[PDB]
Every structure is written in C-alpha cells, then in structure tokens.
C-alpha cells in the first residue's frame, strides 16, 4: 500500500508498505529513498526525527496497523534532537 511522506527537507516520498511495518522501519526507508539529498552529507539520523500522521506524533516501535493508516496518506517528519 503507498503511503507518501514529507521529509525535513520539504521532498515529498513515495513509499510501498504493510500495515505490518513499524515507524521506525517506514523511517529508515524513507532516508533510504531520499538518499542523502537536500545537503544530505549524512543527513538527519531517523532516530533523531518523528513521524507525524494527522496531527498524532507515532511511537517508532509500534506498527502502521496501529493507527489505522490507510492507502495513499500523507504523514510528515519532523525533527527530534
């Protein structure tokens, strides 16, 4: 199922994924698509963002399935030192 994703560098990023995957995984795949781009030396670290989906910032451990997130949604990074 795609989902899209606002990255911090303001890239929008098509990503396939399985209610299974949790939000730490769907955010290393989302820095593995985006590739070091946007000053990218070696980025941000995933673990040092959040992803946000509909105005509830998501817990890293847990799954998509979790929170009822449907085909073609947009979330969004933010940035978590």
Same mark, same amino acid.
């Given at each position: 199922? !795609?989902?899209? &994703? /606002?990255?911090?560098? %303001? =890239?929008?990023?098509?990503?396939? &994924?399985? #209610?299974?995957?949790?939000?730490?995984?769907? /955010? $290393? /795949?989302? !820095?593995?698509?985006? %590739?070091? +781009? +946007? %000053? +990218? +030396?070696?980025? *941000? #670290? #995933?673990d !040092?963002?959040?992803?946000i989906? $509909?105005? =509830? !910032?998501?817990?890293?451990?847990?799954?998509?399935?979790?929170?009822? *997130?449907? /085909?073609?949604?947009?979330?969004?990074? &933010?940035?978590?030192?």
């Amino acid at each position: 199922m !795609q989902i899209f &994703v /606002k990255t911090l560098t %303001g =890239k929008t990023i098509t990503l396939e &994924v399985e #209610p299974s995957d949790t939000i730490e995984n769907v /955010k $290393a /795949k989302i !820095q593995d698509k985006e %590739g070091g +781009g +946007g %000053g +990218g +030396g070696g980025g *941000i #670290p #995933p673990d !040092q963002q959040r992803l946000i989906f $509909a105005g =509830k !910032q998501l817990e890293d451990g847990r799954t998509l399935s979790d929170y009822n *997130i449907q /085909k073609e949604s947009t979330l969004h990074l &933010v940035l978590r030192l």
